[PDB]
Symmetry: C6
Subunit: 60 residues, 6 copies
Amino acid sequence: SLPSIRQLQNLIKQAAPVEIKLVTGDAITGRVLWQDPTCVCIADRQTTIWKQAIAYLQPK
Amino acid sequence: SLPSIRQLQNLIKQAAPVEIKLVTGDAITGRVLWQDPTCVCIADRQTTIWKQAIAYLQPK
Amino acid sequence: SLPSIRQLQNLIKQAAPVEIKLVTGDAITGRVLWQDPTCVCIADRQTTIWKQAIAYLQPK
Amino acid sequence: SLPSIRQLQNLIKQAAPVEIKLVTGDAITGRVLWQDPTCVCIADRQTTIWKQAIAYLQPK
Amino acid sequence: SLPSIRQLQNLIKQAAPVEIKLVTGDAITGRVLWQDPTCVCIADRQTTIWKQAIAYLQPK
Amino acid sequence: SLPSIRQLQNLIKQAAPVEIKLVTGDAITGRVLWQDPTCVCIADRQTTIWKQAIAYLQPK
């Protein structure tokens, strides 16, 4: 899974802001800190997300 | 998984348009740019979809 | 997983019509084209489904 | 998975009636005809359930 | 997975009452009979649950 | 999974407070007592969460 790990990598690398739409309706406005197999960390209060409640992600 | 990967592969090769219905209820209109084990990328603003929120896909 | 692969097999083999109830409320009225590990293809516009948004399926 | 498979096995062996509550909210009243790694089959019209939409099962 | 199997074990061992909140809104009031890889059995009519519709569990 | 396990590990080591947002919409306010491959345990009444209903976690 390169093209997906790599986006996050290049977006933790440049601090770049992001909306993560959780399957809840949770539009999470943050800057990505880190990721790992099961989760992502978002920086607003911090809010670690489970990559599994993830519908879709976009660069703002 | 050839029958599905060949559909995404022949649709990123055509830039053919597509709706992807998410499990939130999201209809994601756009053209497919890449796929991987976990994501699809549509282009209309770019939006990478976790393939795991996907209900269904239709060519338009 | 014989008794499930086999139903689809015998229903792609006879073109036989089918309602697939997605966990969304999406009653998909089609005729099944193919399947494979992760998805099903339904023929109405085509609509590939992720076997994972699948609640239940019935022969009409 | 013996405790669960023995319950479905002793219920298809009795044709005992059953409700299966789906994660859509569906109550599926019927008698169990087969099971497999992914499906259960109820008989009331037949409806094969993806075992993955199952909330819970009760003998009636 | 010790600390979770062990709770159920020690709660099937003492018959102890339990509310299991399914991801449906299904607060299941029971006493736990057994468990196994994929499901739990609850004793009210019995109601086998799929450990997968499970949000959270509490001793009453 | 070090980035996530080290966050739960450094939060059970501090008894630091926490909200865990479930995929039901539940906000679970409390302090973390243990974790395992499938569960987290919060303490406010105790409530073990199946980690699989987790949308996201925030330190407060």
